[PDB]
Amino acid sequence: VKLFRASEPILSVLMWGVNHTINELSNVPVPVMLMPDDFKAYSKIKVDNHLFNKENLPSRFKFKEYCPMVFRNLRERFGIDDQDYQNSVTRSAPINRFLTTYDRRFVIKTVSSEDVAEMHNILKKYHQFIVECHGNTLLPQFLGMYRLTVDGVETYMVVTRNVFSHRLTVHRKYDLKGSTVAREASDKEKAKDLPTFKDNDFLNEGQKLHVGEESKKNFLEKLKRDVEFLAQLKIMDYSLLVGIHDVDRAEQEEMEVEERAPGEFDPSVDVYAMKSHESSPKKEVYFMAIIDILTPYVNPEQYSKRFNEFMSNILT
Template sequence: MRLEEERERERERERERERERERETKRLPAPVVHVKESVLRAVPFTTDTSLEEGQWRDRGREGQGQRRDIGKRMLRLDLPGRRTCTTAMANLGNSGATSSPMVILAPKTKTKKKHFVQQKVKVFRASDPVLSVFMWGVNHSINDLSQVPVPVMLLPDDFKANTKIKVNNHLFNKENLPGHFKFKEYCPQVFRNLRERFGIEDLDYQVSLTRIPPLRSVDNQGEGLLLNSYDRTLVIKQISSEDVADMHSILSEYHQHIVKCHGSTLLPQFLGMYRVSVDSEETYLIVMRNMFSHRLVVHRKYDLKGSLVAREASDKEKGKELPTFKDMDFRNNMQKVYISEEQKEKLMEKLNRDVEFLVRLKIMDYSLLLGIHDVGRAEREEEAGEQVSNEEEQEAENGLASGHMVGSYSTSPEGIAGYMSSYKPLGPGEFDPYVDVYAVRSCPGAPQREVYFMGLIDVLTQYDTKKKAAHAAKTVKHGAGAEISTVHPEQYAKRFRDFISNIFA
């Protein structure tokens, strides 16, 4: 009898517990989402139905902590539904404990949107890693300078300043740029001011040097690099560390000279000086404006020093497509420069002013570079170029041809010469004086129409101990009265001006 009463009370308690579970289930309604069984096994969780209501609240706090742990594990296992509430039924009957619904809430986490990196236009592709680093450095330098206000005046420290960039473990564009390199720019504010005085915008300068890799010049005769920008407005020349030191020694006086003459000069227009270090090898580069035209082809050129000793082009030089003739060749060919008296006076005024500046700095061994564009020959070559086959004409219409005639270069849509192509079309022998600043047109009475390009080159040679020794050796060899090229700066300047004044008709 007592045993039956005990069993009845046990059944009553069981029914009470069942009702309690039903009430708890109604309080936590939630949709059921499938969860991987391995997660539930990894994080066991049981609900003891024998707990009182107050104990349920305490156990609920523990359950929240366990649910957070399960949510984190779900995120690590990359389960679906990580942003939604997840409910699962766990039947973990263990030591008399009965199963109950379990709610698993994954924490709400913010997932970043995927950011697709697009390849930039400027990737600085060049076959030579030195050129790639040079293009990268110029682009970086101009972008940095654009963020710096233009100083009201240059200070002495600006003529000694430099900026350095060192890049290690560069992997984004390793097919085109080396992994380790250094780039150095000398006197950035000074050259920025010089570019402004020469009428060259920094953006045009940047585009001309970095849009397309510079090309090797056909005039490259030495061991170092001699490059032309893709629009042929700039020249990049490799120099020595001694030349860099010489440039630093004359830069302040050079800047003052350019300021006084308002940028009207026959001297080289220096626009930037850099050092590129790749594989522990240092390459020094200086950028200048091209003395020849970016559009008109030069048919003959001379390098004139005013000396007649050993100043004749060699047979090997004469065999080139565009040889560089010298003083004796100029005299033997009976060559003359046909310009008006007004143009001659302006030219000689510039020349005398620049030569006096070089004498003050004790500089010698400079030359007058003379390029001649034959307008008549260019027209004939252009007419011959127009008589192409039907196949070539079709290719030209489809944009497959080279894009320029024989007598003149094609004009670039961007860079220093870019705005001229959209300004107005230029005819044979025509040029823009703001771009081709060294150009002079022949006078109306000349035997043939020509365009002359004249400027001073090789202006970094100072009369030092080496030149004194060379002067003594040549004097012994050729005699004291011979017109050798290695003489005192004052004597060199006088002889040079006398010779140049006689090249005009």
């Protein structure tokens, strides 16, 4: 029984819309393959109620889902049950433009019309890329894309698997581009609780991530083919997001919250999570992934190059 209650009517329409589209997909059979028309398909519903069911939803609103058969196939290829996707968005309102599902599993980013067009233009090759690498990739893992209409204004939304763990807390984070230019977290930004540090906050701090050999080799191979993919698509401005989870600090914080009365993770769920080296000073867990992927076009050849040159020795 789903009230769709949310801080804001637009979140309520989000919950309702994911519930509706997933339920409808339940009655659509799963095809042997995708056809080209699935990559320009869409489904739109326009709801005009009157004196009915307006406790939480607005009376009037629209919901459009893009290429639903494609994003369903992707969900499956990323190992995500449709039932679990629906439950994550609809059992309780997403929270704080960026949202997370209440269980911290998925990220919903508000984007623009141009981002949606870029997704359309790259979706066929992105789907082929996912299929050939079996979902093993640092790239964003796209799960759905929608357009809401609340009070006659459109809002585009992209759903991704969270880069960070859904259960391990991130204690520091960086956004890295390897741009030749200095990107530093502003003193205001660097005054947040969890500031988003940029490249030279990472440099001036002496940060190093130690994962040893096998995980390092996997990460560098993924990184090479991912950013070659982006560059071949003439895509720019993507960043590497890194979150540090301090295992010891978490253990202390949990003991402190319990006083008011493992260090492990599942890699089939936290698919960007890596453990610290065995001979490593502080038991740490790292979440590392490429983000901000829908901006086309100095040369993307050059951005690819500088990016990978920076990230290759982020860790050693």
